[PDB]
From a paper:
The cytochrome c maturation system I, consisting of eight membrane proteins (CcmABCDEFGH), results in the attachment of heme to cysteine residues of cytochrome c proteins. [name] represents an ABC transporter complex using the energy of ATP hydrolysis for the transfer of heme from one binding partner ([name]) to another (CcmE). Our cryo-EM structures reveal that CcmA2B2 form a homodimer which is an ABC transporter analog. [name] which harbors the heme-binding site is attached to two CcmBs with two coupling helices TM4 and TM5 on [name], respectively.
The cryo-EM structures of [name] in complex with ATP and heme clearly reveal a ferrous heme in the binding site. Other residues, R14A, R11A, K40A, T42A, G37A and H184A are in close contact with the ATP, which may play important role in stabilizing or hydrolyzing the ATP. Heme in the closed NBD state has P-His1 liganded to the heme iron at a distance of 2.8 Å and the bond between N(δ) of P-His1 and the heme iron is perpendicular to the heme ring. The heme in the heme-binding pocket of [name] is coordinated with H60C (P-His1), and in close contact with a distant R128C. H184C (P-His2), which is located right before the flexible loop and was previously proposed to coordinate with the heme iron together with H60C, is too distant from the heme to coordinate with the heme. In both conformations with heme, P-His2 is not a ligand and the entire P-His2 loop is located near the [name]:B interface. [name] has a hydrophobic tryptophan-rich motif (WWD domain) of which at least two tryptophan residues W114C and W119C are in close contact with the heme in both heme-bound conformations.
Numbering used by the authors:
A (entry chain A), B (entry chain E): -1 to 200
C (entry chain B), D (entry chain F): 1 to 220
E (entry chain D): 1 to 55
F (entry chain C): 7 to 237
Amino acid sequence: MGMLEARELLCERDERTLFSGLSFTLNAGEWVQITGSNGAGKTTLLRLLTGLSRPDAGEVLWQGQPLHQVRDSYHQNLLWIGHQPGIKTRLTALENLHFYHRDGDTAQCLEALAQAGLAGFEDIPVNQLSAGQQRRVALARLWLTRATLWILDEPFTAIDVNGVDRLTQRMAQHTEQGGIVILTTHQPLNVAESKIRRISLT
Amino acid sequence: MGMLEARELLCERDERTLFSGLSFTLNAGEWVQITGSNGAGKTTLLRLLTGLSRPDAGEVLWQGQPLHQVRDSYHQNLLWIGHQPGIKTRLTALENLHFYHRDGDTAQCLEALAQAGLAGFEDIPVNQLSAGQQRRVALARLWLTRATLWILDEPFTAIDVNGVDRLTQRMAQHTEQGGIVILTTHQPLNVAESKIRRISLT
Amino acid sequence: MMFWRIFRLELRVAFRHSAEIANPLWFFLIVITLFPLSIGPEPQLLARIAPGIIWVAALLSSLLALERLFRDDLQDGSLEQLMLLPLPLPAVVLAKVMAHWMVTGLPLLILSPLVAMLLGMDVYGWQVMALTLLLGTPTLGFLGAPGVALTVGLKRGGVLLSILVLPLTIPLLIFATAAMDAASMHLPVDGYLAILGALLAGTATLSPFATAAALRISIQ
Amino acid sequence: MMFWRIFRLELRVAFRHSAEIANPLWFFLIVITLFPLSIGPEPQLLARIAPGIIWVAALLSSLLALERLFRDDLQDGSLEQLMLLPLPLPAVVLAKVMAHWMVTGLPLLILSPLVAMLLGMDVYGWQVMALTLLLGTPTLGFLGAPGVALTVGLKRGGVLLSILVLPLTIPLLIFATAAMDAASMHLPVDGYLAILGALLAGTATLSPFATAAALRISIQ
Amino acid sequence: MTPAFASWNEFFAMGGYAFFVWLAVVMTVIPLVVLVVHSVMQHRAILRGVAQQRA
Amino acid sequence: QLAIPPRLYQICGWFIPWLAIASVVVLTVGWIWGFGFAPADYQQGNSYRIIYLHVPAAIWSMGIYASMAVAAFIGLVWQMKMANLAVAAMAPIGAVFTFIALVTGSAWGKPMWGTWWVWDARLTSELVLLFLYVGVIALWHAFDDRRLAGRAAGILVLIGVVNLPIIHYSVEWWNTLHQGSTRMQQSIDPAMRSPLRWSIFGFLLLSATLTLMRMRNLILLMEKRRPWVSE
Ligand code: HEM
Ligand SMILES: Nc1ncnc2c1ncn2[C@@H]1O[C@H](COP(=O)(O)OP(=O)(O)OP(=O)(O)O)[C@@H](O)[C@H]1O
Ligand SMILES: Nc1ncnc2c1ncn2[C@@H]1O[C@H](COP(=O)(O)OP(=O)(O)OP(=O)(O)O)[C@@H](O)[C@H]1O
Ligand SMILES: [Mg+2]
Ligand SMILES: [Mg+2]
């Protein structure tokens, strides 16, 4: 009952325990942020939520079944952008975004790049894009994806004040329809406090 | 007066001119922030100041002489931490910082990492650290270097609110003694407007 | 989704202009040329040495291209294929492996007419050379993939991880060179082609799953 | 910042990148073992091809190892040495090449006594081979440094690097194999070693500067 | 005024080495013509894209 | 007074028609003077008529590599873009000339040797020259950003030209270590010498025309965005 759910997630690296007993249920239209300091298990928790890393002791469930059980209807509606954006650095911003789209209509890939602020830099190889223009290539998928679950690991890493505002406004309307956005930002969000469900690592 | 001087610096990458006729002199005590968006030539200007890239036109003079002529004495007083941290992932945090200390290290490097916020992670490989803890290894040099010139390219890339506070206080007493901090940031600095010399790419 | 898109992407990241398509051909030509300059210019000895020359060149090309297969993806995008792409990870591995073959196996097979006369082989020798390159070069990317996936992405990895990359190709090299050598004496090499075909049939079935499991182990 | 500090840092980095420095060694062993397996009980024919295959294996192992010379520096810290470290960039290149040889060319010299027993050479033949690897592998590293410096920005990790610096090693291959072959006839090899030393001295002087220029080109 | 052959391609075009002589002629003319044609067609294609980007 | 704006495009365009006409005319006269009028030698018979067609390519492959080395030297020390661009304009032409020399010498020695490929000093030296050419071509095309390919290509050309005499002398000595010397000797004969000179000059003019055309194309590719290309 409900989308992505943690069931007593436990994880410890080296000798410190990052978290234990993490049990939260996420429903539709819910904007959440994984609050934590620098060094906590925030990226670790996000990778557990995407299924990239198996929990030490616990399980994550999508629609009621474990992520490894389905693995096919979960990746279908799931968009995760981590610390590494996941874009080929020699390909241009278009053919790199063309790969991640459902069909690559090239009329929506150009529209998404323009909506992400990367207008006029579609055909330049992304290794020549500066530092946040490279980050905007991965973030341009936010305007293409039909996924109902967004997993973002510091999406404002090198984005300017206008790009952060446009990203925040894009994430706001996605959660207004049916979407779920799990976020980890060290920069405070410029959105109302009642619209964010902060869950800590305890 | 005039530790560094820009002498009509021009950079025209493709059809876009990032800046033209830039001339600014920086004496001791200057806390200078380069302002711009995600496409403006901020990293390009910083790499020109360090001498990594030579300008299309104009030149940078350290103390009154071109960088290539006094490259030996320029690197003595210079500190670059760019978008790439400049540290080896397979080496530990202490070993990476051990490489950047002239003498007395393995006892001052430990204290420097404590100031940067990495107490207890000195003997852990960098690739096993968090995204923001990996940035703090390179930023631990701020507490070790005797260089007078600091040229920082987004030092708050993945640093927490407390770490950003310590970095701001760190490069605030450096400029009080008579040092230079050249900065490019997207997070607004938590210091008075009079303490920062905003110069844009006009 | 759409396995073939992954295949075409791995092709695109390899060749970025039409002029780079011939680069593996030039590499093979230079490697072939390296041997007369050392052994000597006599054509009879180059013929008896030819199986070793050809398969050393094939192994070198496969080793060079195997590092590009997975290592470059960990820095940016080895994920977004485990995490995304509702096709199973073995399918992604298979697409990457056939792209790796097409950048290494095809150039040596396409150029095999030309290098079968620089060394001095006849038609039958060339026929067996091509039939073992077609049947053995794709394997070089299958059984080398699980070892490469671990080595290029498992931090704090020891020397023993290198036992699973090169020394696993010893039986393949031995049997392929033996097939070519027996073809030199104009002998029925049908028994050796069955061994190479049983390796290709068996390895292509287990390598994608083994590589997928290795990637799952290494990412965590 | 010091010359020896950079040398030790590169040595330490290479040691922790294990299974990447052992792969060239495995390739060298497989190359020098495959040919004696192909050619049967023919001691006369083995002696004629032994120097050539030995030095071709050394060259190809050097090309396999040359990938990591500057590769894991452009992503993180190829700068901080151009931009800092008042030590001149040619000196930085020299230290890095020395540290690369300590893990690339030095193992081939340590393994040379076992190669002599495997290939059935004499004590004098081993002496000449060891002197040839001692004077030839640093030349290999110095010749391959400019190519990897030019191709570091591309990060091909493939056949491109093997078509830039492989033609440049032809004189070294020729004279090394000639020295080793003349050792088989129990002939004096003083002139061949003199030529190899001349090549080493010539390459070791201009290669640091060429590599520094190429690194400056690639960093921008 | 004084040719090197008694008559036409019944004597010319075959000096006993006709295959080797004419293989060299063809195999040198073809790459030169390929270079010339590629240069001209690439110039035309570049000028086409210059006006194409003007849209 | 060297101007070096995009006016080099106009200067290249001015010389291309006359240079092409001259190259065509001189090749036609040299290949009609040879290949049908000049006598044939006693030993090789009419297979010797490949001098006019193989020798000029072999000469001008070395010539084009030397010109590329000079251009790379000029573009390295003086920081010139067009000198670095001239290397890329000349590299395919030199590679084609090396290929032509290789395939016309193999077709020439085939009646004598009895095989289409012999590992002698001549073939090996031109083979490694072609390896250098294709390495330069691959390095230039491997860079997404121009004006950085041309500096890398120029440095590679300088490295190759420094090592070229070493490689050539090593290959020449490697041949004597195994077989000993060339086939018999070098001889041209007075009657077959003038058409060979005309053919060599014709290949020189053809290479000049081709490098002007390629330089013009590369100038357009570089400045494809400047307002000067409003044409
Ligand atoms: C098989 C491949 C061959 C290659 C790669 C080759 C290469 C060359 C080169 C590089 C030159 C330049 C002049 C020099 O180096 O001194 C040349 C010229 C010449 N070649 Fe060859 N050659 C080949 C075969 C032959 C053969 C079989 C003949 C038979 C006669 C021949 C006859 C000549 C002659 C007479 C010259 C004149 C040299 C001069 O006057 O400078 N070549 N060739
Ligand atoms: N090789 C290259 N590397 C970086 N930028 C390049 C290159 N070639 C061209 N450029 C262009 O030059 C401009 C320089 O921008 P710069 O890197 O200073 O942006 P930035 O302010 O650092 O961005 P951010 O704030 O995201 O770090 C970029 O817009 C880019 O499009
Ligand atoms: N391969 C690894 N990558 C990252 N962290 C690791 C790894 N292995 C162990 N760890 C440890 O697990 C802990 C979890 O770190 P995590 O990556 O969650 O930090 P984070 O909260 O994402 O930091 P940031 O907010 O800067 O990204 C870290 O303290 C780290 O020491
Ligand atoms: Mg993190
Ligand atoms: Mg930047």
